[PDB]
Design a protein around this ligand. Structure first.
Ligand SMILES: OC[C@H]1O[C@@H](O[C@H]2[C@H](O)[C@H](O)[C@@H](O)O[C@@H]2CO)[C@@H](O)[C@@H](O)[C@@H]1O
Ligand code: NA
Ligand code: ZN
Length: 377
């Protein structure tokens, strides 16, 4: 049966429309597991060509949702090209999402001392990057490259590969140049809308669903989520990102569930897909060598028990850095099939999460892209 969909891009390809329809249905039957750099970064992988993952080595299947970033698309592509690996993920029926760690359009010529000129350069650049602003051409250059990438991202039959494109995330904090100290809510909304319009209307991107993802709220209300929300005309996917303590984390887990419940209820009301677009133990705790060997079991237990939170389409955890990060300190979220994670109980935790009937990995999702749809618009 053909389902009626209303997308940000009413001219989206049939496969893109199908992806939306798939998640609309699937989300009330499972939660898909997502992983950033699934087949491009791992502690246990010997090839980064898109054929291996730490997830696969841990549980025998890939993540259902594959996350990557504009750090692999926009010059200087610090994270490396991902076209081949995206194509491999799509060929095995996976779902692709790309987040936007854009450089700072006001300061990107000044790179040298980290974090100058990067997403993490907190110099406000929202006002300055909108049309009329001096750095609008710099932002447009980034968007040009995203569009060229999207417009040429084709499968073996020459059809465009759908991507869930997540823009200006974690915007309710101030660690990024598009954050809440860097912009009024109206200015942020304009940046998001301008960028979607540029991609869709100026550059003709037809294979994107658009995702919005602030941080978790501690005062979990619709009014709070709506303050910087770009609007129903501009967003297909309602998400949030949340990172918590490794220890004494019951309150944080309740907050995860509350935020997921909110986005799920909002998504049903607004005809959107609710997701958790980024979730994990906070990086500093992992980097200190700490672990919670019940983390994944607590996550799935809490989510599936709640009648609203359970309705999210996916949750995504962050990258498994093969050599960690400079402190080298560990920086990974999927427990690896190796002595350290066997011994500390985290591998068992993740294997139990995989075994859970409500989690969906890559072999658990079928006919994602061939569903008939009608479009409103
Ligand atoms: O891959 C881009 C950088 O990602 C960082 O990880 C952050 C991420 O920026 C988000 O804030 C959220 O997902 O939390 C993640 C973990 O703290 C780090 O992995 C950097 O090393 C990357 O360059
Ligand atoms: Na679900
Ligand atoms: Zn159903």
């Amino acid at each position: 049966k053909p389902v009626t969909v209303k997308l940000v891009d009413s001219q989206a390809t049939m496969e893109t429309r199908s992806l939306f329809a798939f998640m609309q249905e699937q989300r009330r039957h499972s939660i898909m597991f997502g992983h950033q750099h699934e087949t491009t970064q791992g502690l246990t992988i010997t090839r980064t060509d898109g054929t291996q993952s730490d997830t696969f080595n841990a549980v025998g299947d890939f993540a259902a949702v594959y996350g990557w970033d504009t750090l692999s698309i926009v010059a200087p592509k610090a994270a490396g090209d991902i076209v081949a690996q995206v194509k491999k993920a799509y060929a095995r029926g996976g779902i692709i999402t790309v987040s936007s760690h854009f450089d700072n359009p006001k300061t990107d010529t000044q790179k040298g001392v980290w974090p100058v000129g990067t997403s993490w350069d907190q110099t406000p650049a929202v006002v300055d990057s909108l049309p009329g602003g001096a750095y609008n051409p710099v932002l447009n250059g980034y968007l040009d490259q995203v569009a060229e990438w999207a417009n040429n991202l084709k499968d073996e039959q020459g059809r465009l590969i759908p991507v869930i494109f997540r823009l200006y995330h974690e915007n309710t904090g101030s660690w990024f140049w598009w954050g809440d100290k860097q912009s009024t809510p109206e200015q942020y909304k304009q940046l998001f809308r301008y960028s979607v319009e540029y991609l869709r209307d100026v550059k003709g991107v037809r294979n994107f669903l658009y995702a919005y993802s602030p941080n978790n709220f501690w005062d979990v209300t619709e009014a709070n989520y709506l303050e910087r929300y770009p609007g129903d005309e501009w967003v297909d996917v309602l998400g949030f990102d949340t990172y918590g303590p490794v220890a004494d984390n019951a309150d944080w887990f309740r907050n995860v569930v509350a935020n997921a419940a909110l986005v799920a209820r909002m998504a049903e009301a607004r005809g959107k897909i609710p997701v958790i677009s980024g979730i994990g133990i906070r990086a500093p705790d992992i980097e200190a060598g700490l672990y919670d060997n019940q983390w994944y079991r607590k996550l799935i237990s809490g989510l599936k028990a709640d009648p609203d939170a359970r309705e999210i389409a996916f949750l995504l955890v962050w990258r498994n850095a093969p050599q960690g990060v400079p402190g080298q300190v560990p920086h990974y979220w999927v427990p690896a099939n190796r002595p350290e994670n066997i011994n500390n109980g985290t591998l068992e935790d993740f294997q139990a999460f995989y075994a859970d009937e409500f989690t969906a990995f890559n072999r658990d999702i079928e006919q994602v892209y061939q569903r008939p749809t009608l479009i409103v618009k």
